[PDB]
Amino acid sequence: EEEAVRLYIQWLKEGGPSSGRPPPS
Protein backbone atom coordinates (compact mmCIF):
# COMPACT_ATOMS: atom_id res chain seq x y z
CA GLU A 1 0.00 0.00 0.00
CA GLU A 2 2.24 2.75 1.35
CA GLU A 3 4.40 3.36 4.40
CA ALA A 4 2.55 6.60 4.74
CA VAL A 5 -0.80 4.92 4.87
CA ARG A 6 0.48 2.50 7.36
CA LEU A 7 1.42 5.62 9.24
CA TYR A 8 -1.88 7.00 8.29
CA ILE A 9 -3.90 4.32 9.92
CA GLN A 10 -1.38 4.57 12.68
CA TRP A 11 -2.26 8.28 12.83
CA LEU A 12 -5.99 7.84 12.93
CA LYS A 13 -5.51 5.12 15.51
CA GLU A 14 -3.15 7.25 17.62
CA GLY A 15 -5.13 10.45 17.09
CA GLY A 16 -7.09 10.99 13.88
CA PRO A 17 -8.64 14.20 12.43
CA SER A 18 -9.12 16.71 15.25
CA SER A 19 -8.78 13.74 17.60
CA GLY A 20 -5.11 14.25 18.10
CA ARG A 21 -2.52 15.13 15.49
CA PRO A 22 -2.16 16.51 11.91
CA PRO A 23 -2.31 13.77 9.27
CA PRO A 24 0.60 11.56 8.12
CA SER A 25 0.49 12.38 4.43
Curated annotation (Swiss-Prot):
It is found in: Secreted. The modification Serine amide is found at S25. Expressed by the venom gland. Venom protein that mimics the incretin hormone glucagon-like peptide 1 (GLP-1). It stimulates insulin synthesis and secretion, protects against beta-cell apoptosis in response to different insults, and promotes beta-cell proliferation. It also promotes satiety, reduces food intake, reduces fat deposition, reduces body weight and inhibits gastric emptying. Interacts with GLP-1 receptor (GLP1R). Induces hypotension that is mediated by relaxation of cardiac smooth muscle. Belongs to the glucagon family. This is Exendin-4. It comes from Heloderma suspectum (Gila monster).
